[PDB]
Amino acid sequence: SAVIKAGYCVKQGAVMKNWKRRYFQLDENTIGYFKSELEKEPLRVIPLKEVHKVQECKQSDIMMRDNLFEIVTTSRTFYVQADSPEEMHSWIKAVSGAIVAQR
Structure with missing residues (x-):
């Protein structure tokens, strides 16, 4: 259950649809994000089993x-901006591989 991938991305917020830098963390069962890399508790956890697409x-x-x-996901689509084209592809590939491993 160690971390597969972690890093900052900028995601769209629900309240007013502004964009904020958050620290994302993927492990074998979840992707979550945190206020920063220092925080112990996430703001949100998304179980990979609830992910219909990552793309x-x-x-x-x-x-x-x-x-x-x-x-x-059924209730919400999350919009996540990586810091580069390379990191966008890295995130998509990592999340999709973790979902495959759940099959």
Whole structure:
């Protein structure tokens, strides 16, 4: 249950749809995010079993955000901007591989 991937990404907030830098952490069962790398408790945990898709966001142009992927769950789609194209692909590949490993 160790960490597979961790790092900062900038995600869209629900209250007013602003974008905020948060620390993301993926392990074999969950992806969660934290206020920063120092925090002990996450702001939200998303069980990978509840992830229907993880993919490049096709609305990246309209949302005016480069390097944007999304995590689709029934109740909410999360919009997550990586720091580079390379990190966007790294995050998508890591989350998708962890979901595969759950099969």
